[PDB]
Amino acid sequence: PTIQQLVRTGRTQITKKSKSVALDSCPQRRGVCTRVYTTTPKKPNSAMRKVARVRLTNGNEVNAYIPGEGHNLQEHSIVLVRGGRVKDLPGVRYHIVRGALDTSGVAGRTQRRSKYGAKRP
Amino acid sequence: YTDPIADYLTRVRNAVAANHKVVEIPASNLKKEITKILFDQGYILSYKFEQNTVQGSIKIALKYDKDTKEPVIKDIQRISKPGLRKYAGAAKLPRILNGLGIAIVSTSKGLMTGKQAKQLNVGGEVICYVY
Amino acid sequence: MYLTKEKKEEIFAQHGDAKNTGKAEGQIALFTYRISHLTEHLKKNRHDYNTERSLVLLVGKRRALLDYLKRKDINRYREIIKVLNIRK
RNA sequence: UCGGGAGAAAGGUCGCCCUGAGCAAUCAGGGCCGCAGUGAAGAGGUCCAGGCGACUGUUUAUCAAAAACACAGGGCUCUGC
RNA sequence: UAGCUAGUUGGUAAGGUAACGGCUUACCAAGGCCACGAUGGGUAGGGGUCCUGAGAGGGAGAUCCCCCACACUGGUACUG
RNA sequence: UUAAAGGGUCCGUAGGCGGUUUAGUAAGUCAGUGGUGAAAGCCCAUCGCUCAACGGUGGAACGGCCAUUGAUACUGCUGAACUUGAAUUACUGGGAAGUAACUAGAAUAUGUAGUGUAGCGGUGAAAUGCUUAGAUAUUACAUGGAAUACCAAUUGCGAAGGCAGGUUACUACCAGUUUAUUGACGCUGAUGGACGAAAGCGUGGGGAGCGAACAGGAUUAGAUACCCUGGUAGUCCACGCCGUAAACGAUGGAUACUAGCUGUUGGGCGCAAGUUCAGUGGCUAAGCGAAAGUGAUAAGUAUCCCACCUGGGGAGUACG
RNA sequence: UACGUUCCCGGGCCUUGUACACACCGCCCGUCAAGCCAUGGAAGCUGGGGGUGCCUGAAGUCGGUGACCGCAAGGAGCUGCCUAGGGUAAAACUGGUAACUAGGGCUAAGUCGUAACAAGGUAGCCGUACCGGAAGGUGCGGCUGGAACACCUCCUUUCU
Numbered sequence A: 001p002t003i004q005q006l007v008r009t010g011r012t013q014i015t016k017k018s019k020s021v022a023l024d025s026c027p028q029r030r031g032v033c034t035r036v037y038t039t040t041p042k043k044p045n046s047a048m049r050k051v052a053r054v055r056l057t058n059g060n061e062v063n064a065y066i067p068g069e070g071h072n073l074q075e076h077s078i079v080l081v082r083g084g085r086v087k088d089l090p091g092v093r094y095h096i097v098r099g100a101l102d103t104s105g106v107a108g109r110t111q112r113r114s115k116y117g118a119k120r121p
Numbered sequence B: 001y002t003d004p005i006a007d008y009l010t011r012v013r014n015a016v017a018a019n020h021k022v023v024e025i026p027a028s029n030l031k032k033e034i035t036k037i038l039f040d041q042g043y044i045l046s047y048k049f050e051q052n053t054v055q056g057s058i059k060i061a062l063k064y065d066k067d068t069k070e071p072v073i074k075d076i077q078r079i080s081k082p083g084l085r086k087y088a089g090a091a092k093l094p095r096i097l098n099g100l101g102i103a104i105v106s107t108s109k110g111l112m113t114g115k116q117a118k119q120l121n122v123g124g125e126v127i128c129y130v131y
Numbered sequence C: 001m002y003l004t005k006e007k008k009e010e011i012f013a014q015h016g017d018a019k020n021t022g023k024a025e026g027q028i029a030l031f032t033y034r035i036s037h038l039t040e041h042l043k044k045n046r047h048d049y050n051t052e053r054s055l056v057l058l059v060g061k062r063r064a065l066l067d068y069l070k071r072k073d074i075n076r077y078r079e080i081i082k083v084l085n086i087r088k
Numbered sequence D: 001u002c003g004g005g006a007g008a009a010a011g012g013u014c015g016c017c018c019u020g021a022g023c024a025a026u027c028a029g030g031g032c033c034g035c036a037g038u039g040a041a042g043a044g045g046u047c048c049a050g051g052c053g054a055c056u057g058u059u060u061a062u063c064a065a066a067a068a069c070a071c072a073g074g075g076c077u078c079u080g081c
Numbered sequence E: 001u002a003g004c005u006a007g008u009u010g011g012u013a014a015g016g017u018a019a020c021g022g023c024u025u026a027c028c029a030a031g032g033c034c035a036c037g038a039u040g041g042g043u044a045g046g047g048g049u050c051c052u053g054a055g056a057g058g059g060a061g062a063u064c065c066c067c068c069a070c071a072c073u074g075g076u077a078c079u080g
Numbered sequence F: 001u002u003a004a005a006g007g008g009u010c011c012g013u014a015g016g017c018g019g020u021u022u023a024g025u026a027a028g029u030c031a032g033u034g035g036u037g038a039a040a041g042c043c044c045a046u047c048g049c050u051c052a053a054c055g056g057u058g059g060a061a062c063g064g065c066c067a068u069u070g071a072u073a074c075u076g077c078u079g080a081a082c083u084u085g086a087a088u089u090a091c092u093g094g095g096a097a098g099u100a101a102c103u104a105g106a107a108u109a110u111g112u113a114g115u116g117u118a119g120c121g122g123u124g125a126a127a128u129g130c131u132u133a134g135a136u137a138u139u140a141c142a143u144g145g146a147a148u149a150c151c152a153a154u155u156g157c158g159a160a161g162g163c164a165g166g167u168u169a170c171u172a173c174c175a176g177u178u179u180a181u182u183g184a185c186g187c188u189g190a191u192g193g194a195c196g197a198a199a200g201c202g203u204g205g206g207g208a209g210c211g212a213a214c215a216g217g218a219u220u221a222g223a224u225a226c227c228c229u230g231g232u233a234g235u236c237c238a239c240g241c242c243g244u245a246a247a248c249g250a251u252g253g254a255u256a257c258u259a260g261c262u263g264u265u266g267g268g269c270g271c272a273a274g275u276u277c278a279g280u281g282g283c284u285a286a287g288c289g290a291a292a293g294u295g296a297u298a299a300g301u302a303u304c305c306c307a308c309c310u311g312g313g314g315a316g317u318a319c320g
Numbered sequence G: 001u002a003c004g005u006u007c008c009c010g011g012g013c014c015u016u017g018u019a020c021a022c023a024c025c026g027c028c029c030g031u032c033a034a035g036c037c038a039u040g041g042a043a044g045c046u047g048g049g050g051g052u053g054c055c056u057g058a059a060g061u062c063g064g065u066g067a068c069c070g071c072a073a074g075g076a077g078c079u080g081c082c083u084a085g086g087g088u089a090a091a092a093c094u095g096g097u098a099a100c101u102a103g104g105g106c107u108a109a110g111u112c113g114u115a116a117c118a119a120g121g122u123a124g125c126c127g128u129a130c131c132g133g134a135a136g137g138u139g140c141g142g143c144u145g146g147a148a149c150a151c152c153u154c155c156u157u158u159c160u
Helices: A003-008 B004-018 B029-041 B114-118 C005-013 C024-039 C049-072 C074-084
Strands: A029-039 A049-056 A061-065 A078-081 B022-026 B044-050 B057-062 B076-078 B102-106 B111-113 B125-130
Touching (some): A061 A078, B004 B022, B004 B057, B102 B114, C049 C074
Antiparallel strands (some): B102 B125
8 A cells, every 4th residue: 555554564474374284394204003994075975985093203193095995004004194185084184105114005006006006017 | 735746747637538728737847847848759739838827827738630639648657756756877767668658857967858868877866757 | 712803903912913813923822812711611511522622623723833833933932832821 | 449468478687806988877898706696585487278257346244256246338118397 | 572771871090801891890970772663582593695586576594605603511711 | 335445533643745936055866986795606708528517717797885076957954035725814694513501382191170971992803901999081270201293304514423392691613705914834644632323330310101121911833022901120310431333425534637417505796697616416428347336525537644455164253 | 607806726928126046845044962173261280491589509710818838939728709500489481281161163964943035924234231942032223235105285475
């Protein structure tokens, strides 16, 4: 508006709140799972999505989504969370890297092998 | 008032929009200098300095074409304002209408145009610009 | 503040040039007179906000004139405030 | 409840001699003595939380001093000389 | 985060430090800062620079160079 | 204006902006010179690694700062002058503009007295209710409280809230015009001050009608409501307290320009026509707007100042 | 037998209002009951830095004394100020946790009612006060951001 008003109090710039916050601004974070279960999407989708409660190394409890099919993910397993939410499960805001320290990859996968951690046949 | 120069430009703009013939603005040294510059550049037909007032009047005749009138003054605006004064040396003069318009610049010598002052290499304060 | 033509002529002649009804000194004297003669009415009509606001407006006008005098001539300001008992 | 709580709580000096600044007082520097210097006697223990009663006050002389009575304040009702 | 500071503000004489100075001491006065942000809290080494952007701007301060601070955590002095 | 956004309204402190002419300085502004703005890095040009990356050299850049010399058009400062802005004075007027004190009538309620008998009241229909202890109805008188039919309205006044029976006193404000007078004394205005519908709170009166809550009757499957019969606080007065509204023109305050038609309010000039200021409505051109619409009393074209807005919910919520 | 279209049902046209458009057999509101999530209050519990007021205070620089070593200097020995560290007392900031408790967002769309959207069947909304299982009801004031209707009782003038 007025130049005098701008000189008195200028324009306020906001901070642009981040997307992935509970991983300490790191690309990947190691964690241990405590409860691997299945949830439902909101609507109108109908499925049984596989999620796991992961406790990261910085003391943060998050819900991660297991991509693909075929995994072990016992009650205690070392997983590597990377990030990336889903628009179906309310609360799950992270993903697990397939091919990490303890998590399994995929078998019979030939198209998207860089993802899902699959070796070249 | 708050800006006699802004009023002088606004009266001309309103008369051009309303398709008038003459304007009877109040007078002052700066307004007379601007009127002389505009008449030398060819944006107005004629001007008369009318006496018999405590301040004096300036009667300006606006110019239109003899067919498809199309007033030659399309946009006459200000750059310096009483709330923000903008000065510039002889390197930051504007480029009004890509060299096709005029920019009045009050210089240390007098009132000149943005192109007539860059040759003299003097700066000053940009007052207004006309297309 | 019952102001008559004779009272105004007297309050202007007291400061000089009774025909000079535009002098800042005479205007300040008139304002002070009709403020002193109104703050007393406001003591028996304490619920007369309509005249309280007019008294505030007169105070504002007198303060504007006093500021004009202060900015133009520093001596006349002191003289007028000392003779009229204004500014606390 | 703006008055209190509150001396809240928690701490420091105190003797004798000399010098100086000082309004008598007192203060500031040194030195000396003893386990101890307001060297004896007299002079608040404090804090936290709850029940009752706002408070000062009065009460079973001679086993009960209180949460009991009173109290300022609030209310209903009677009374025209 | 609306009051802060009691050697604090100024002065007079000494002690001083390479050197002026409340740097320190003795005496006198109550001053000094504060809405143009004192004080208090959080964060952070600063710059030349790097990325981006038509530009105005915005975001960081690795590697190269300059300045400052530190050497297990703190204090003190000697030699020079 | 209707998408998020004009403070409820004025006064005013700090601050921001400044009518015309003229003299002086040159602080801002402009130009030149000297010093500096390290090296490295980016860009340009040119050479050596077979090209490139890389390296060497040169220029530009480093938008900046200090000293000095000039110009004076614009802003700031000092001095002087002017009336157009502003204010004061004089004459004609203008109003539900405020505060205080008196006073009038109609109507409702109650009481007394006279007449008189079976209903009155209410609803879409009923009932609760008052009545043979004489109601409703009518006449005369008395008591008390609140509000003012006709005038009366896109009227008028007030900064806003708001202001209506009549009279007086004490004030305030506004408009026009032959005057006279001062000479920029002006606009806005964060903190701040004052006023501020109704409802609400404290103390003391008053209480006719209305009536939150509440009690009965009725409707409904139910009716903590709409409907009916009563009714406390309140509505009223004298001192105070809070400071909220769809406090709305959902449109901040100034100044200057830009087509008309048609009413009306108060002035001036007019023997009438009609003309010119100050307010108040309607139609509409250009112009604005996403459109609805606005349109000389702008939401049209400019300048100054203040407040506010930055997806919805959470939320005007939590904490202080 | 039919006086007739004021009512019941269905259909057509014009205008009007709409928060509906798979189009009122629409949309949508609130409480209660069952889960998941994050954030407040709270008797208490447990910490983290920094500040201030006292006591004690190592080494070290700088003063006093120095009756003992030395021929003078000087030193030994006592001792004073300053100050790391330790102890103590009351507060300020801030983190975690806690029986219980208030409200918010979703889940399958469970129970109860139909408050708003048409004149939404009592027009709606704003401020305020009271009341009620709940949406909500009522009193006072204000707005149209509401629909349907929407020109009039007196007809004409003398200075009272």
